[model samples]
Target: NNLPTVLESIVEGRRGHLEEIRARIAHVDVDALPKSTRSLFDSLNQGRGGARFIMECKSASPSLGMIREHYQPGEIARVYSRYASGISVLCEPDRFGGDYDHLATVAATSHLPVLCKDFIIDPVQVHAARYFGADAILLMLSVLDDEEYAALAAEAARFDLDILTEVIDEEEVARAIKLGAKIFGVNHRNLHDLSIDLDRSRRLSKLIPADAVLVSESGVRDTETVRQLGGHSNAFLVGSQLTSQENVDLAARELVYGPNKVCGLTSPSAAQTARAAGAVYGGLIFEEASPRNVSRETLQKIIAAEPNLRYVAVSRRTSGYKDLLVDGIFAVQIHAPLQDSVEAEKALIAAVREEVGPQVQVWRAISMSSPLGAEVAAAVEGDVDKLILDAHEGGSGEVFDWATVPAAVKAKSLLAGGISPDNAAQALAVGCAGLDINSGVEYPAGAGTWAGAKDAGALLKIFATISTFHYL
Candidate 1:
């Protein structure tokens, strides 16, 4: 699925169509401001975080020849808003004979964000896009290069036009991301050959960064396919499916959420910590071998339940075994046991040192029980701006042999293991770093899940335990 079709014949067909569109429209003032909907395009450009479905209202497509002769564009949008994140309108007058008025009409009629799907190759398209109240414009890589694409995209942005650039390969995805195309559309069906390849989107999705919202476009028909595409896409734009329907909203929810599919385990702490860390995180695990794996519908449920969550991430059996916590917390814990290898340890140490910068009292977490462990302790004390040897059993919650550890490691250390609020001072008396508790203080003696996790009151006991020794 990773490898793509290398046949260059399709490239020849696309070249003329794209060039014709670009040459025909030299300069477009598509950025005329719509007073009533001034903030709509800007908002659309920012984040479609929870946006799951896009409904398209088109009278015709190049492949299908004619979609719906009697399709009501305005009413299609009214119902579409109930289940769809945004409404997409076809705006090519020469090929499919779609009207430019469809964009303004949809925007005027619906509450959902409106996208103008056109062969936009000029500034004129940008001005037309803005004048008609479109929240976004479509950019296809079949037409332009880095400079040309950026120039067109930048000109559109000048008029507050959000560009949804479509790319067929990884190169396009990388370029679009670099050029600030926040809303990216991956067309599974090649515009030239019209061959439908679902895996194309899957391959491209992996290359996209977590921050960018991905749109899987073209050749989407059923809920299952849309659900499958959700593995990589923030939303799906189904022109064929929606155009085939008299009532697009019914098609909307079914495609967006899927059918009774339960999915990955959610971590409540993971969400809270990510949000607090100033990074967006969201995800649903999906391995059938474990209890953690879930159905697609259930995955959507978890995401809908927590809208602010940024990653619907997963952990495979092979990788992500360390169960590392990535936050500013570890930026202080230089010797935290999350590192399992020398490279891992070096990476963690380097990241911590970088964050701490010059002459900062960096709190290095040291475990001094093992021979290699002592090496970390000694290395930490010499380089760390300060040391916080919370425990010695590594991450196993076992206290180290206090005698074997150097006096320097212990001098600045805080005894961590087996020390609760009742005995925090007892550990503080030891020449050790501050408390380091993983399973010891966790809700279930391990990383907590979202729904099954404990609330704030439950954690207050741990806080009170730590507070008991603050006066010392």
Candidate 2:
């Protein structure tokens, strides 16, 4: 909502660009700009359940001014080939300072599949990508309608080129869904500063199908961001993060992991506050029924926001437990007994234990509702990494008598269920490692049960109370 000056400034000016593309076809291929094609679909599909770097090469953007001073497409292609799963060359020209020559040069040099990044509004541009040596092309939902896409995709079929359908929001996703696309590029561009809004990708994640080859386009700042989108996104189409850096190899290294500089670099105040509050562990919910459930979009944000905290994905469903490995989860707690037979439940638990690597802890959450609970707790305590003591399962936010939990049971446990700001201290005093407070700290239900996200102020108050324990 900040400013549309740079936006319509380009979208309107693009009208002239479209005319020029037709003029070129009428191949400035004038059929000679042609080269061979690579398979962007196969590259993404084969690398499924991972974050592929569609590392982008460009010189500048209108919002940020000059992106890279020494813009050399052929040179940048080699750098991209060293680390990229694929390469994207911007050809938008006017606003982004992109060029068709850039796409051709990179296309000639790089083995990785190349995508022609452009404001493709016409059918001719689809052919333009192919004629200029692109394995794939982008179709922006922001600019085109379903019929327009159908026509362009029809043009794409003529050349056997892949279409990266870039969707801007949920509204766009709904429109994008009507047309068939093999690859979906979830986009988040901030109108104000023009920084790629990576968080917006998370908000729209649920609307997209898991099977589609998903790419999180632009400013993919961290591995945690990739991890959270684990099972869903097949690739991350990164632009400014690499384009802005001098050290492309190290930039590739940073994009994979080891952060705090060059990309997704955030405020210092955040790390300070999280560390000062003794925030040791973070919770990730996977249960769809619970209000606290997280999607590929929301799950990794907690880890991305505070990398220091050990994160555990609390899951009941089995469809995506295997996928969490891609998310960089520290621990995976399988929410117990999904109405499956006890034997099957044991098998599921054993299966999870077998699949996740040595780095991940296979924690268990159990109801402390019966003596059966006590016995099951003792049994699981011997096998699992840690225990979550809850009155009933599903994190119902119901508190129980603290006296009932055996000291031995509470010894290696996290006290869940009904941990509010009012009782956080008491829960901590119960001699567990910490508390798992979800519903207690969530935004109040007045807006609607799921209308609001988790609240920060309530958590700050809870953490402030936690800080009081450490006296000078």
Candidate 3:
């Protein structure tokens, strides 16, 4: 019953390939390799709360076979750029269809950091990852003996590449810790049967070092699943879930940036552009008078077109939440006017939470007209999962007093209203978790607010300017 698995074969084949590699070039010259520019460690640590994603680009895999029939490495990576914290490209040539050229092209093209995903057992392989434009490399602990891992890891640091120390079980975690590995990836896929278990990460989570950054690898299908792993995993390694699909923007859905919510979405074009530009949450306004107001029918069409974003209904009323919730939208950005008493405000928010269920995220949009409002937002922090410190009631095209923000909700708040690219630096300096934009990113010439569709050309500039923005 205990026979060699597919994993065993892949590793064995890798061992033979090393010989051919050695015949070509006995040792990797560190001086000859291109200088590594980005750090995967710093990128993951710049968190705005939930799990940041490292999108993977692969032609095929052993488990599912060909993911994208026509796999274009550079093209796929270019798409991954808008939403990815970092790019993970398959460099393995055997079972997983990838090559050095694929990785090189992806690295050369992507402005974001790149991680070379491969079965690396040798120091030469580690150097190759660095030589071909990888800012980081993954070292699996299951295959490598402690000594072998130590050597490869040493080469990784010497090559100026960050290491994603991939661990499987308790023993692997112990060995990885003993070896002083800092960045850890908890792979959910079992090597023997190729079965995926998210519990593997959960079970091992208790034993991992508190200081090390955790990434849940494999079996992450969508944004909802990633949200569940949130408090435990800092980042997620998504492969087949992204590559297996036929749709481009829908499959890649959720142009997830740490401080991103492209609010006030009405049209599918707005939804599509926001997602493709890398905004995390699509703001669905339910207020009737607003130009960005969404009908349930339109919302369905938007989701069908751009499935990447976590849809949040931005409304002052609780009436439409049930319908939106039933439509598979769970997050609410409510501009509920709070009462004077803390107990009264808490009761109001509690009622909303009960109606929506505890699983749904409630983001109270507090008007920043006065400092007292920030206090009110901070007071009932327990009632809501997130706080939005907006200008008036969300779509107001005016900037507020940044100094008036209370210290309490600063980490949990998403700063909105009148935050244009010109003053984005000043708004970001306020120490909020992230930004929520509507007018600042409008189509044609980007403005405070525009009653029209979003321009993809403008999206390119906006996301690039704010791509590196993270919560303070």
Candidate 4:
């Protein structure tokens, strides 16, 4: 019943496999592999925009068993080369029915950048991947500890190999960022349990630094899925669905060009302006102490006007806030110091989640101006659905040092504070999920000119600047 702890054994077995390969290929030289190859990072990021595809040539998986019995890695490479921006050849021989020889063969045959996909734990494998014709190597944070990952990454980089560091959560994404990883793989599959959750990648995708190339791995079954993922990911590492196709070529083409056709509960009239300005979500202040606070009548009007926009009721109240969940409101952002206790924070999140049900999103707000590190982000991991990093107190006009914010925190953040039309390009460049504002696009709360009404023109300018700035 214990099954000899499959994953652990596989890791241990991989160590042994490494030794065996080392001895078997001791005399092999790096020059033996073909030299003409493009950088994986360059290949994946070749074009300016659009989701790049990384087709996998995996023969089998622990959960899916045999994928392709023929298992001709070179032939698979040829097929993937036609459309895929890059190719991933699983080199772990046992569980995946992959072979180092297959990887070497594919490297020699394919024009596309080849990723040596394996449970790599050593610098030896990094060397091996390079010597065997891989332009990139996967360093899974799930398998390697920080020191090991850092060391392996350093060695891989020495060989000019791009590191496709894989992570499953925000903390790991932070760790990868610390190790100077510029390319990331947000794997949907959990290596610890082999469970697949596509949404997991979507949620974690934002945590990845905007400058990094994001590869949403596993569970991508169709072009629709690829199109949906375009907003969060820069590239996709598809295996099962693409490999299982009766016509892999057609599947690859579909995913590449697919019906690439291209929410918030917001104010009806202001929401219209905001929507046209390209805003996905709108917020109404619920903190009674705040000058931006809106009345029920005002809130109702906004809601009535923008029935389809995603609306958020931003508040600091820890409890007795059930009324904030208006019919189509998307989320309730709870600002920090939760009842002044960590336990209360948990209780508050639980209570809000219970009230809103799973359909509605719960965003926990933390001050970006505060020294909230990855540790703090990890502390509130599952307590809420998302995190809103705001400036101290609301409308403080103090901007956070974007560099000080953790990569994971920034990835999941809806950046607020000191954001205006002039500096919006800089704020949006951080690549937050969305931007939150108070005074930036407002007429200074009670300027009388707008009488606390949102400056639709200002909001439109902010959006226009963000869109034209090339923040993504």
**Model 1, 413-436: lDDT tens per residue?**
544444443454455445342343
Q: Model 1 — which ten-residue stretch has the worst lDDT?
A: 257-266
Candidate with the larger lDDT of 2 and 3: 3
lDDT at 112, model 2: 82
Candidate 4 lDDT over residue span 66-159, tens digit each: 3445767776677677667788888887788887788889888887878898888876787778777888888878778888888888777566
lDDT of 3 by residue, 53-115 (tens): 788888764435334356787877877775667889888888878877888899888877789
- Over the full model, what C-alpha lDDT does candidate 3 score relative to the true structure? 0.72
| Candidate 3 clashing pairs, residues 3+ apart or interchain | 253-308, 254-308, 255-278, 439-448, 439-449
Candidate 2 per-residue lDDT, tens place, 36-130, comes to: 36778887777332236688887773324234456787877786686567888889888788887898899889888889888777777777777
Error of 1 at 49 (Å): 8.4
Rank the candidate models, highest TM-score first. Answer: 3, 4, 2, 1
Write the number of the candidate with greater TM-score, choosing between 1 and 4: 4
TM-score of each: 0.46, 0.50, 0.58, 0.51
Top-TM-score structure, candidate number: 3
- Model 2, position 258, has a per-residue lDDT of 23
Please give the lDDT score at residue 150 for candidate 2: 89
Error of 1 at 423 (Å): 42
How many residue pairs clash in model 2?
3
* Candidate 3, superposed: residue stretches over 4 Å from native: 1-4, 23-35, 48-51, 61-69, 254-472
